[PDB]
Amino acid sequence: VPRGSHMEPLVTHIYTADPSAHVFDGKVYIYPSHDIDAGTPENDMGDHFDMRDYHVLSMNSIPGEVTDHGVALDIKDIPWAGRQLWAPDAASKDGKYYLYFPAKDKEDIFRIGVAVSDSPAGPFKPESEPIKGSYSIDPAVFKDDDGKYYMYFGGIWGGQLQRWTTGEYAGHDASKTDLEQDDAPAIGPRIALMSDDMLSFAEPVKEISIVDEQGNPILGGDHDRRFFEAAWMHKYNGTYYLSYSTGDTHYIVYATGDNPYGPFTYRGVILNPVIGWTNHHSIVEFNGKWYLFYHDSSLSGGKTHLRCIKVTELTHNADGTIETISPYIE
Ligand SMILES: O[C@@H]1[C@@H](O)[C@H](O[C@@H]2CO[C@@H](O)[C@H](O)[C@H]2O)OC[C@H]1O
Ligand SMILES: O[C@@H]1[C@@H](O)[C@H](O[C@@H]2CO[C@@H](O)[C@H](O)[C@H]2O)OC[C@H]1O
Ligand SMILES: O[C@@H]1[C@@H](O)[C@H](O[C@@H]2CO[C@@H](O)[C@H](O)[C@H]2O)OC[C@H]1O
Numbered sequence: 001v002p003r004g005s006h007m008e009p010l011v012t013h014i015y016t017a018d019p020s021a022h023v024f025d026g027k028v029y030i031y032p033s034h035d036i037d038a039g040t041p042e043n044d045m046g047d048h049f050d051m052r053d054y055h056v057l058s059m060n061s062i063p064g065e066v067t068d069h070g071v072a073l074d075i076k077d078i079p080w081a082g083r084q085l086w087a088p089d090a091a092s093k094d095g096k097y098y099l100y101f102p103a104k105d106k107e108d109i110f111r112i113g114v115a116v117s118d119s120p121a122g123p124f125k126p127e128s129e130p131i132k133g134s135y136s137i138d139p140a141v142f143k144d145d146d147g148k149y150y151m152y153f154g155g156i157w158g159g160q161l162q163r164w165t166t167g168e169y170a171g172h173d174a175s176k177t178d179l180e181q182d183d184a185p186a187i188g189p190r191i192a193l194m195s196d197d198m199l200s201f202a203e204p205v206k207e208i209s210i211v212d213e214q215g216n217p218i219l220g221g222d223h224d225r226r227f228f229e230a231a232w233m234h235k236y237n238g239t240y241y242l243s244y245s246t247g248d249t250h251y252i253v254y255a256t257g258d259n260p261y262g263p264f265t266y267r268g269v270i271l272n273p274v275i276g277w278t279n280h281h282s283i284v285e286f287n288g289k290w291y292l293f294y295h296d297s298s299l300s301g302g303k304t305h306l307r308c309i310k311v312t313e314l315t316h317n318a319d320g321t322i323e324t325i326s327p328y329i330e
């Protein structure tokens with residue numbers, strides 16, 4: 001049956017989260033997390049998010065029938081990964097498809113790996129080791145108009161980004177949150193140009209600067225605006241849009257810049273808070289319309305770790321601003 005007409009759950013037979021949407025072969029492919037009711041301890045490091053595999057979803061139209069393509073990748077088959085298959089993304093280059101995924105290695109350190117397929121629907125064969133120089137979570141691999149591909153990544157708190165300031169992991173007794181200096185600039189997400197073969201980074205990883213409207217860095221104490229997780233990049237009318245989740249304040253917000261590396265100037269809210277703690281999205285153009293894919297905990301009766309993906313239309317104004325979406329109004 002067709003789904004996606006009035007902000008209803010796109011699928012109900014499994015729990016789904018963290019929708020990363022792409023247009024491949026004239027269809028929308030969605031690369032979400034597959035939530036399961038593991039019953040694992042709940043805490044601020046996110047041990048209750050104990051996902052173990054990915055299912056790729058696809059739609060030929062919006063609204064439209066959603067196809068579940070089965071298990072595309074299983075943690076038991078990723079040699080380096082021990083637990084927690086968190087939010088993935090995909091990219092397409094030269095007839096191959098690449099699935100990028102965060103997971104904990106055997107030392108309990110989040111890394112980002114790649115798995116390869118001949119189809120956007122998978123299944124995917126993981127590389128035996130994670131990407132060299134990767135760390136933390138939430139990859140978004142963005143193909144720019146010039147054919148260059150960039151990975152945006154990172155997440156604080158349970159995502160461990162705050163433990164990577166020196167190029168070495170600070171350790172399991174290091175900060176559980178951020179820099180713990182609220183008057184310093186907040187931690188920014190990470191970016192690296194991808195290698196030609198899509199399996200590695202082509203440069204040393206860089207940090208993205210996010211500034212306010214006056215050009216001042218967004219500060220660590222500014223939880224309404226500072227980066228938490230779920231970086232996403234899209235382009236509209238020559239402007240680069242960095243959007244992300246603010247975590248403990250539950251917003252998707254956005255900031256604009258003139259190139260992939262920024263700096264990005266904070267503009268406003270994309271999506272107000274949803275049912276459940278997390279908020280995670282993607283923004284994609286399909287048949288000349290822009291869509292915001294997102295999730296909430298509505299299907300599970302409000303359980304933060306059992307989510308369902310949803311979609312709605314997103315409106316850019318010609319001046320580059322985006323209309324804020326409130327999830328439960330229309
Ligand atoms: O110190 C403990 C770690 O050993 C544990 O890390 C897990 C070990 O098993 C691996 O298969 C997993 O990838 C890894 O996360 O995490 C908890 C910590 O107390
Ligand atoms: O890494 C992130 C975790 O740090 C985050 O943990 C949340 C922190 O606030 C608590 O009130 C929530 O219960 C807990 O889920 O969860 C998301 C994860 O990506
Ligand atoms: O147009 C206005 C901006 O000038 C304003 O910028 C704020 C100025 O004070 C700083 O401390 C803030 O960080 C910065 O956002 O933002 C609101 C807007 O109406």
Ligand code: NA
Nearest residue numbers: 140230231232
């Ligand atoms: Na993302």
Ligand code: NA
Nearest residue numbers: 268269323324
């Ligand atoms: Na707004």
